[PDB]
A paper describes a structure:
The polysaccharides in red algae (Rhodophyta) are primarily mixed galactan agars such as agarose and carrageenan. Carrageenans are high molecular weight polymers having a linear backbone of repeating D-galactopyranose units (G) linked together by alternating α-1,3 and β-1,4 linkages. Furthermore, transcriptomics revealed upregulation of the CarPUL during growth on ι-carrageenan, while biochemical analysis of eight CarPUL-encoded enzymes revealed carrageenan-specific activity, thus associating the CarPUL with the ability of these pseudoalteromonads to liberate energy from carrageenan. Detailed analysis of the enzyme activities encoded by the CarPUL, combined with interpretation of growth phenotypes, have allowed us to propose a refined and detailed model of κ- and ι-carrageenan processing by some Pseudoalteromonas species.
Despite extensive efforts, we were unable to circumvent generation of this inappropriately matured form of the protein. Therefore, to provide insight to the specificity of this enzyme we generated C84A and C84S mutants and attempted to determine structures of this protein in complex with neocarrageenan oligosaccharides and fragments thereof [Supplementary Notes (section 4) and Supplementary Fig. 10a–c]. The complex of S1_NC C84 with ι-NC4 revealed electron density for the substrate that enabled modeling of the non-reducing end disaccharide. The ι-NC2 represented in the model spanned the catalytic machinery while its poise in the active site revealed complete sequestration of the non-reducing end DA2S residue in a deep pocket, showing an obligate exo-mode of activity on carrageenan chain ends. The 2-sulfate of this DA2S unit in the 0 subsite was positioned relative to the S subsite amino acid sidechains in a manner anticipated for catalysis. The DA2S unit in the 0 subsite is complemented by the shape of the active site pocket while excluding solvent and is the only component of the ι-NC2 substrate that makes interactions with residues in the active site pocket of S1_NC. Though we could model the G4S residue of the disaccharide, S1_NC makes no direct or water-mediated interactions with this sugar residue, or with the G4S sulfate ester substituent, indicating a lack of plus ( + ) subsites and that the minimum recognition requirement for S1_NC is a single non-reducing end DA2S residue. Taken together, these results support assignment of S1_NC as an exo-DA2S carrageenan sulfatase that would likely have activity on any form of carrageenan having a non-reducing end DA2S residue (e.g., ι- or α-carrageenan).
Author numbering:
A (entry chain B): 36 to 507
B (entry chain A): 35 to 507
The structure:
Amino acid sequence: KPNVLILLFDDMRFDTFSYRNGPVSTPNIDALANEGTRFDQAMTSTGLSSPSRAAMFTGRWGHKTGLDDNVGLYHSRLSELSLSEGSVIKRATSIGYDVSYVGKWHLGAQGPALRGANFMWGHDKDEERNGRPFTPYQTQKNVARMNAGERDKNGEKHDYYKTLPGTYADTVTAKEVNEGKLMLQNAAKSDKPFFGIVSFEQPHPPYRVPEPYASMYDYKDIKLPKNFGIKRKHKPMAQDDIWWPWHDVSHMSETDWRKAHSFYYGAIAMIDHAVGELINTAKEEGLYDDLHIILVGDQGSMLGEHNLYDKGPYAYDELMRMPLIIRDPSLEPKIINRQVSMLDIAPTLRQWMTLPLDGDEDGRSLLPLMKQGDSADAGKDDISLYAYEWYNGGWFGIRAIRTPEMKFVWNPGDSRDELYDLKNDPYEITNQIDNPKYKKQLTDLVHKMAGELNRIDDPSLTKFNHHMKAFL
Amino acid sequence: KKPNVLILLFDDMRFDTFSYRNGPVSTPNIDALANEGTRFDQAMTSTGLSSPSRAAMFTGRWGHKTGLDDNVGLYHSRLSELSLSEGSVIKRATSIGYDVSYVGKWHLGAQGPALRGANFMWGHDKDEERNGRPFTPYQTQKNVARMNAGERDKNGEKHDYYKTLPGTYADTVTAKEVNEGKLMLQNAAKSDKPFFGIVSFEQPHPPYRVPEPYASMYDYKDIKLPKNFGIKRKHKPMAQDDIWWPWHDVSHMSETDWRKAHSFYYGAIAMIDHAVGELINTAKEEGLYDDLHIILVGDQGSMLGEHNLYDKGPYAYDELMRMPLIIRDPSLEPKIINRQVSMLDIAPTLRQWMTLPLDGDEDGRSLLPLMKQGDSADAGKDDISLYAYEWYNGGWFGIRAIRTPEMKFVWNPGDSRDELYDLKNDPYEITNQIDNPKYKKQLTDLVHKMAGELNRIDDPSLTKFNHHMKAFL
Ligand SMILES: O=S(=O)(O)O[C@@H]1[C@H](O[C@H]2O[C@@H]3CO[C@@H]([C@H]3O)[C@H]2OS(=O)(=O)O)[C@@H](O)[C@H](O)O[C@@H]1CO
Ligand SMILES: O=S(=O)(O)O[C@@H]1[C@H](O[C@H]2O[C@@H]3CO[C@@H]([C@H]3O)[C@H]2OS(=O)(=O)O)[C@@H](O)[C@H](O)O[C@@H]1CO
Ligand SMILES: [Ca+2]
Ligand SMILES: [Ca+2]
């Protein structure tokens, strides 16, 4: 029974790291990438926290678990992942793993402890279950101030980017690391197999770091991508609406957007130091050599691509794509360019740990890809499936199917679907849905989506067959 | 022995406009119906939204039982139609030998009246394909952007709020709904079979669009704006702030725009009164009126700037929650009912008139006892109404309100902030007393009445309610 460490980050994009030729120097994450299996085309299940995490830890889609929206926020109906979903946590506990959890759970108060883990520390540890949804009255007042032309300390906008007082050592990140360190030290003192999860608040917006991370990257030198700052042309209505109060960016200057980038870059550099600290402790404790590691972000974050901030009910690559590294110490490093899913994590954990089955696996184990490379999946369609059922009590029922060359997004709460040519338009600027030159590719993607919805027993397949009846 | 039944169903018609309610619009034909029938002066809709209110009206069951708990066919609702397994009063009436005819807005899924055995004579929904793409308001969004840049439409108007239409009464959708109503009554007079007619008027749904002379009949300059007009919402839930539909952004509205919204609305009500007179006169000419069993009702009210709100949204304020209701039974003396009644009470009233067979639960009660006996039918019973706002066009809110003559408690389970209004001292619902310890006793009573109502109708949200209200339990 191998020891397992999961390093799980909140809204960490795929593309920032120096190992991806990104603008931030990340030597410790780069070294883990180069020792392990790089999943360079990993996709999350949903660009939202609780759904992405329920998918990750159960191995089933939201329509099967019931966990299809964030919990505990205006105006979601949900409070917690059902305790009937044990997750990999209860399954690992059942076969003799000591499970430990540090940091943000976001699947209901006390959730890791209720499923048999040592919940060492985190926001969710000692909260009462079934709390009133967190309604963002303070964010609403602050964004009204920004629209009235006000700024916070030093010209900053604290709903987007913020210089924190003190040092790295005073940060929540330093505490997540210190608990990780204690988890590793304690595990080294037991004969018993260990399953450790460290869920970091970083780099969740607003992008908040102390010095020197706050000024490490000069806002004036940021390279803004081709889809930065644009008017959304023929895009669905849900991309326009102010779902969360900070989604009003009408007040944001190019300088505000550059600082969003520069402070995000600071957070990634601060994450790299944190990863280094935990890896080095694991080495000092004689655990690193045999440690089975997953480094993953629950989803990406928008830095003004399509004039969007944070995340919302959409499928653009900057949110849908996730960083993923899985290190099996028995295997030679490889780079997987075939698309993989957040639904593939739990099966990977299942094959490593010999977890008992607790029902369906909607994904597949990544072990064959890790051993054999992209050749494991030769012959097979290269597709990913993404859902955005809900955003914080708004229902959208969104589904996207992504090939290496094309993305089809179904928006059943709109009349307007999306079709992107990822080969000729990788920044997803032009919606080709009504473009007759793309009929053959649309038709192919509609059929692949109907196949995926059937495979996972999505009850929205009926409505899909109605909306897409021009193609069956 | 089985009575002829006519329903006149209006879209977003408020309770308070009519001259019989001492309202600002002269409505002699509705006034005459009110005087010959039973006035339900404290009628409440089930929901301030169209499809849910109409599913409740026609099935007699709450949306958690029918599945019809949001508008159909709109950004970004999940719904397209009432299940065909809900036959409604239409299928029930058909099965016992009623000729059922439907004119105008159904809003419960394309061809719905015809699938349930009605003659769907005319209406938006009559010839549509089922399972259509939701109508996404791209044009209304672009219009409201223009209004935010300080633009106006033709003649200084704002066509998402109020509009002078070209032509005359005779060119209007209302005139067509009336002509089809006239043909329904003419045809019914030729039949041995009992008749169940429904005329569902588009008016007076915003934007408030009428031809002359209705467009200028009421002078915007003379409108009396109520005490809750134009205010900053203090300690109100967040759902009242958000721009759910693009025209809910009223940051651009002048006091004159709001007065014109009133004055054009008043024009629509005067044009509705003419329409009602037309149909009542046809029914008298056809020798149907003397035995005709009639319901006049609006599916809900409409906000004209109370709490700085326009149209409707996920809230429970009286101007939206209250509905006009008149039920005329020709065998009975006129009465005024001040006891609260619900949209859930329509179907049971139809069931007792028509002897419709049971098709499952009735979440309301028949209004025949109140129509015969007056308010004292209910002596020794709590005077309550129950209101839900489960969804607004794909936003989930799960809202529930309990209203007594003196108090309203609104549960907002998608928020941390509930509402509590003293309707005796604050009937404009300006002050949220939820956190006011002087109102602990009234809150406690209303929480228990709500728990009882949720239990009575088997609402699955009762579990969450018990968690949110555990300080009571
Ligand atoms: O409770 S949390 O959602 O974990 O934290 C919130 C809030 O997170 C959100 O931020 C906006 C609003 O909904 C989502 C995002 O669009 C959610 O992010 S997600 O968890 O990554 O899906 C966060 O912005 C604020 O700083 O803290 C609150 C804590 O109540
Ligand atoms: O499809 S309809 O809803 O019958 O008509 C709509 C629109 O009505 C709506 O207007 C806003 C958006 O949702 C509701 C209201 O807040 C809805 O009104 S309701 O049906 O009474 O709940 C209507 O104004 C316009 O004429 O047509 C559109 C599309 O048919
Ligand atoms: Ca996240
Ligand atoms: Ca209506």
